[PDB]
Amino acid sequence: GVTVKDVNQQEFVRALAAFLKKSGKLKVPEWVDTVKLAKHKELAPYDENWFYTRAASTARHLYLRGGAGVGSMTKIYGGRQRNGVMPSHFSRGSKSVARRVLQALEGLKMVEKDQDGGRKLTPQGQRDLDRIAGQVAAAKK
Amino acid sequence: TPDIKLFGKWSTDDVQINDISLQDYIAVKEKYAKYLPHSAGRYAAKRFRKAQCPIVERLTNSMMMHGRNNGKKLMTVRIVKHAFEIIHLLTGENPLQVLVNAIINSGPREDSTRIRRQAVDVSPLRRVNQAIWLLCTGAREAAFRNIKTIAECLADELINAAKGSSNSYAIKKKDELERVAKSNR
Amino acid sequence: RDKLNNLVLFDKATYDKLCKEVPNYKLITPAVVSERLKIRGSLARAALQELLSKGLIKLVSKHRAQVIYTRNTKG
Amino acid sequence: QPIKLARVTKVLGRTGSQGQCTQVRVEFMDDTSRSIIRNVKGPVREGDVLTLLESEREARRL
Amino acid sequence: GPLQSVQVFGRKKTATAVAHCKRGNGLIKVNGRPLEMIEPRTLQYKLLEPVLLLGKERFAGVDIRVRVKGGGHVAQIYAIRQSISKALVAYYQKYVDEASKKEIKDILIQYDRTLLVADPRRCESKKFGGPGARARYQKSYR
Amino acid sequence: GRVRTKTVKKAARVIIEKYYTRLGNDFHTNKRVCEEIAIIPSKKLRNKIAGYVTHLMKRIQRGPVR
Amino acid sequence: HRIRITLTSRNVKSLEKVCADLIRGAKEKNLKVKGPVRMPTKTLRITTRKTPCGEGSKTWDRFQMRIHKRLIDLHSPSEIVKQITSISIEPGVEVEVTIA
Amino acid sequence: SLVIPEKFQHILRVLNTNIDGRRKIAFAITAIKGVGRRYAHVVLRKADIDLTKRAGELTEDEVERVITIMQNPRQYKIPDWFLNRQKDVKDGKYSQVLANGLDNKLREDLERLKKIRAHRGLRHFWGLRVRGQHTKTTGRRGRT
RNA sequence: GUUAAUUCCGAUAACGAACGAGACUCUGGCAUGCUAACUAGUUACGCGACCCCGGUCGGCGUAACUUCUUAGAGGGACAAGUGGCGUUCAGCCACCCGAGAUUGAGCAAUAACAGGUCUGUGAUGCCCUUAGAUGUCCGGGGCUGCACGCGCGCUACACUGACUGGCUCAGCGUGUGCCUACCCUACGCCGGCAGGCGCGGGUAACCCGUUGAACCCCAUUCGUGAUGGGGAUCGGGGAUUGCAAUUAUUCCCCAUGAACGAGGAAUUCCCAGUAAGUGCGGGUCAUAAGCUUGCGUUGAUUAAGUCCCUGCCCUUUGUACACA
């Protein structure tokens, strides 16, 4: 009886995103390659298939803590913005990426717009992430 | 539990300090055998508590130098770990014996001071301090603007100094200091 | 005051070279490999990876800042 | 010309133009009869061993 | 049978770790995660020092669940290590005889005192005229 | 620098003869003596007075104090 | 019957005295209450430069103004509680009654 | 694989500019003026060039495919906000200027401002700072 | 003789005193002992979701309880125990037990400066001007101007690194206004970003907020090339604030890609959760931090000394000095 908590989280996201690629039911956006992930960043993501990871990462985050809205997702993925000859600061992520990712994980039944705002993990979507932890846990062993 | 071994890989036993002059100022043995080169602290509170700090810890603390990496213990700990790995597979025995031998051969035994300068000998504690200082600064300068990583620069500096080959930076400073001191005698 | 001219891809004079004595080094690392063969750092990483698969060098440690290789045990 | 090593018997005081060198008297373990006074640079306890490159010159008292 | 519970806390700079030790079959888990999967992984033997220095047979029969809040990455590491050691001592004190706490407490201290006694060091305030507690701005005589 | 100021020394030198029969040998018992037998504005000053009185008694045993 | 009273005052010595009295002032009339609960102390800080002129060493003032907050609650109708809080109020302490 | 190809070209000539073949393709084509560290990356993704390949490794059809994309950005789903000459004054056309075109275009804008004797034109003529920053103690070594 | 101390012991033509120091206030540490907690929580219970009896659940509700959170009262540490040094006094060193055997600030004497402030004041003497005003208001410009010299800082010169992903940790503290316009923000849609549009909470341990902060950590690409280091300068475009932004307020996008390869003589700050790295709040704020003032995080090398340099305190001594 394994669970997302009990398995290594670093390669858990790698396996969960590859499952989404095999499904082919995510409805990726059309500017996936010409967009920059956040203003504090400097280049486009090196891997072309980042959208499968970004969807996977948010789906993992919604498991640990529910009720995370779009304004939460931009704060979770923010980082240090180097401002030239200015001291660096903290800059939030992009809203559009979070919105389309959350709308992506809702198109197929993985999340739902629960009350009080934000999104939570649906009971059937919870099964999917628990199935992945099964194969990741045994693969290391 | 017995046989506390560094990193869970290197055994602290079978390490022998040949020079009795610095025996009590190098902490390798059973009372100071720890799984990690990381420790809480409280070693600078009094004058001689420094000698009860494990020697591998004292080397890690001598690697957070030159501004860019003050107070970065995690990066320094992993540097020593990788350096100890490649000292073993390049020399063939426990790196603790390599590090200890370098300390013995690198700490200068005589210096000069303003009292024209007079030649005075060095106390055992400062001999340890100078050794760790010299061994680390050699690795730092050998890795700056160079392709090879900081880990192997630290590895060969310990290896070269242990054999006393004179091609290491630490030894080139020791004989310099002892040759100047002799001329000031 | 000195300039390094490191190639990016093996010549046929060079690929056959590191299949002879590189699997015989005690210490194998992209940094040390680069300076003996005068090749780019990335080139050594890609080459040392292929030799790893063939089983002629065994991996002892792997970190984002350094990967370390040894040679196969004698006999 | 061999090299001798000796142990300090007590700490006499702090000397030097800037208080950076200590006078202590050393006692050879090779010979338990001969003791001399020497300057030493660095923090020194009582009973530790000093490596004497040459052990023929005596340090004047302060 | 009766519930065998004791809840002890651990301290560091600001991080605190309260551990609920009950009677079980040898379970250890932090925030719902095991000890080995605790970031950063480079500081892993710091968590494993009390268990390795005592063995699993002493941790058999109990379950530990440590929850943490505050401090930093390294500060927490020294808080979980603080609570698990203190929890085992406070268990053998109340539900096991005194002869079992003593040799446990001897072993823990002689490895390091700070494994059962908190560290009083705390950050100190910043004074005006300097970037920190004791540093001062550059003098500009001319 | 643990040097007793005249305020701590004077109170101890006055308390001690008025209550030599009550004041004893240990610090904790005569800490309780001073709290009620004389008004002390603060704890930290009471401890210093009581501590010096304890030190004074041991001197009295060997020989008279001037 | 659920009524809650708030006690906010700068002085911490006096605020407890009124707090202590009303717990006694309620328990005497055998009506159950929930104990004195204390909100975290609020510190107000105004850091300013000492000198009105320009020169001098750069010196600053550390002003503070603490606010201590207390809550007590009663299960009683309005007619009893009006006269409870109308007697023996320290001038520093202020009392405000609310109905849940 | 890791052996030098027989067709490897150490210097490529695109848009009257030398390109270092020993460099990665994404960063090598940055050599021509008008393309940066990001516009180069999207161009090589609007088309299908293996980013891992170095500049001197890809075929001549592949490079001539790349050149056409750059000079006609709007024809291949390049967003309009990703250009450096959006909504110009001459033809109102959102275009991408490259190599000598960027140098020629800049010099015309500088003489355009001086044509009407605007303030920024005069500052450029006098060789001073134009964006309102202080010139009391900065930018000294250039001005003798 | 002693102390951090004109702090004490003690000598004594002095006796008894006064301020300052110390005492004192706040703050840090630690108390499973006390008082409490639906604006703080824990444990058990009963559900429910998921994995295969157990496990996870900041998903829900409830019976005790106060360890974690909060805030009050008391406690606790005193050179008190022990061993040496000492006129055997004042006291000092070390060790045992201990949370702790020097936490950090605040306040702070007599005398003086011709130190700064008349641009803080309806604090003010005297002098000047007062209707073509040195009063007050309105429009525009300047206080930013650039052959140069100086000071406080920020960003850098790279691999102990940069970039792209993933992973995981805080603490102080603010928030809708007397005039007075001007608050903090959750959620959902629109956009690539800056942002815009509907909707709710909060006068606050109630909501933003479990403040998902950086550094750090793991995995990629780069490979010693002024290069994917560095981001100055300059062109084009889009928003927000404001009655008005041009001499670009600020923000965002593309492109442009300078010096800089560790810094001469010289000089500053610092010794323990300290230096340094790192980010986050208040102040200034219509628009708003390279500054200051606070907070946490990661966390050292060296040293327990001296009067050599710069100065300070007491005694003796010389003086042709006394705005010294």
Ligand SMILES: [Mg+2]
């Ligand atoms: Mg983040």
Ligand SMILES: [Mg+2]
């Ligand atoms: Mg290097």
Ligand SMILES: [Mg+2]
């Ligand atoms: Mg004056």
Ligand SMILES: [Mg+2]
């Ligand atoms: Mg004047």
Ligand SMILES: [Mg+2]
């Ligand atoms: Mg006149």
Ligand SMILES: [Mg+2]
């Ligand atoms: Mg000005």
Ligand SMILES: [Mg+2]
């Ligand atoms: Mg460059």
Ligand SMILES: [Mg+2]
């Ligand atoms: Mg860059």
Ligand SMILES: [Mg+2]
């Ligand atoms: Mg004379």
